[PDB]
From Swiss-Prot:
Obligatory cofactor(s): Ca(2+)
Catalytic activity annotation: Preferential cleavage: Arg-|-Xaa, Lys-|-Xaa
Active site, renumbered: H40, D84, S177
Disulfide bonds: C7-C137, C25-C41, C109-C210, C116-C183, C148-C162, C173-C197
Highest classification ranks of the organism: Eukaryota, Metazoa, Chordata, Craniata, Vertebrata
Protein name: Serine protease 1
Subunit composition and interactions: Interacts with SERPINA1.
Location(s), subcellular: Secreted, Extracellular space
Recorded superkingdom: Eukaryota
Length: 223
């Protein structure tokens, strides 16, 4: 997260870190057994880490649970990033508390102009590289679909939305991938892609979760 703020320990209790020997993506806990992340975060041997603040220090509230299965969206296209969403099932249910909690799926899509909360342990520099220890957060508005398409001509599908600041300076970044965009208390987006981070006229592009609720519900009902 570039140009954001320190969230505060366990104030984003649905935020997870995906670990394969090292943190590589974020994710969102949607119930005691399932995490929503980006399909471009897929790999084998994922361990899901819940209740994290400092990802490099065991502070006492963590739950580390191995993934038993990963399900990439059947129409995920890794070239265009269309349908950039995947479900990860935990091999055992998380214990839900104040520091580890699920986030609701939306019943309707979010509105242009709505301020959402984007979070992660990704790069904090728009140029250069610096990774934070503690979870970072950013308040950013959903952009109009026409400004989104204008920013990325030929690349924005109905399964994507832009959020952020056209002036630059504030954005999600590498390492935030797969993490939550929460608007009005619902998981509305997943950190997906962008041209660099916090660049002028290049806002963040996010998977439009409201399009996938049926698939999510069907998939979790059968796996
Ligand atoms: N909002 C952005 N500008 C943005 C969003 C997501 C990414 C993700 N890159 O994937 C590689 C990785 O995470 O290691 C980059 C930039
Ligand atoms: Ca920790």
């Amino acid at each position: 997260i570039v140009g954001g703020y320190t969230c505060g320990a366990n104030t984003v209790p649905y935020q997870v870190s995906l670990n394969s020997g090292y943190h590589f993506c974020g994710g969102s806990l949607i119930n005691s057994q399932w995490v929503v992340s980006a399909a471009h975060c897929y790999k084998s041997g994922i361990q899901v880490r819940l209740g994290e603040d400092n990802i490099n220090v065991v502070e006492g509230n963590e739950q580390f649970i191995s993934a038993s299965k990963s399900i990439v969206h059947p129409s995920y296209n890794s070239n265009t990033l269309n349908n950039d969403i995947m479900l990860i099932k935990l091999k055992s249910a998380a214990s839900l508390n104040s520091r580890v909690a699920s986030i609701s799926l939306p019943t309707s899509c979010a509105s242009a102009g709505t301020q959402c909360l984007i979070s992660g342990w990704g790069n904090t520099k728009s140029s250069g590289t610096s990774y934070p220890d503690v979870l970072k957060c950013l308040k950013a508005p959903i952009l109009s679909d026409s400004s989104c398409k204008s920013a990325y001509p030929g690349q924005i599908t109905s399964n994507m939305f832009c959020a952020g600041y056209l002036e630059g300076g504030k954005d999600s970044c590498q390492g935030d991938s797969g993490g939550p965009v929460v608007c009005s208390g619902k998981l509305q987006g997943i950190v997906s892609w962008g041209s660099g981070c916090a660049q002028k006229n290049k806002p963040g592009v996010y998977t439009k979760v409201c399009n996938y609720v049926s698939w999510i519900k069907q998939t979790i009902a059968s796996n």
